[PDB]
Amino acid sequence: MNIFEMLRIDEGLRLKIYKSTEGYYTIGIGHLLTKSPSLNAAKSELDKAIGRNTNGVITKDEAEKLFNQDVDAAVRGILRNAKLKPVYDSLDAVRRAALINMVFQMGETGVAGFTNSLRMLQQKRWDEAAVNLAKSRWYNQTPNRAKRVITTFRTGTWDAYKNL
Ligand SMILES: [Cl-]
Ligand SMILES: [Cl-]
């Protein structure tokens, strides 16, 4: 298992614009287009991202290209973040994949706000961190996905994703 397969399981794959769990226009493998309520605004963002007149439909290769760019940006956002970087550098490979997932879902800024959980992760207090992470809107809004990521941080294995 790897970050790619992991997030592809968490986000799924859709070739037409759709509304995410937060009601924002998205496409492909969780690629957010815009927070605006306007479909046109989303189709515009989409064409600009793809470099062609899409008409709200992309191919599989194009989704995958957006995905590669997004994973990359997530890693780089972590590395450039003074609050995230140290955490990331202290973890093992599996847990690093769990931090990337959160950053991809919620943005570098949202993740840097889990101050207490970040400290526990850094301290390698797995069970405590797992409990702290669960006390969040994140966990209450998307509990199944949050559980998979939390389990990952807790056990350092891919068990929550084996089966999927
Ligand atoms: Cl883009
Ligand atoms: Cl969920």
Q: How was this structure determined?
A: X-ray
Domain at 17, CATH number? 1.10.530.40
The tally of domains found in the chain comes to 1
**Residue closest to 26 by CA, chosen among 9, 8, 45:** 45
* Residue 49 Cα to ligand 1 middle (Å): 4
Query: Which residues are close to ligand 1, an ion, with C-beta < 5 A?
Result: 49
Residue 85 neighbours by CB under 8 Å, 6+ apart: 78, 79
Burial label for 152, CB within 10 Å (0-12, 13-18, 19+), is buried
* Residue 51 Cα to ligand 1 middle (Å): 10
What is the distance between the alpha carbons of residues 51 and 57, in angstroms, rounded to a whole number?
A: 13
* Residue 138 Cα to ligand 2 middle (Å): 9
Q: Position 102: which residue type?
A: M
Q: Give the domain range for residue 32.
A: 1-164
In this structure, what are the phi and psi dihedrals at residue 19, rounded to the nearest 5 degrees? -95, 130
Whether 105 contacts 12, CB under 8 Å:
no
- Tokens 């287009």 -> residue: 33
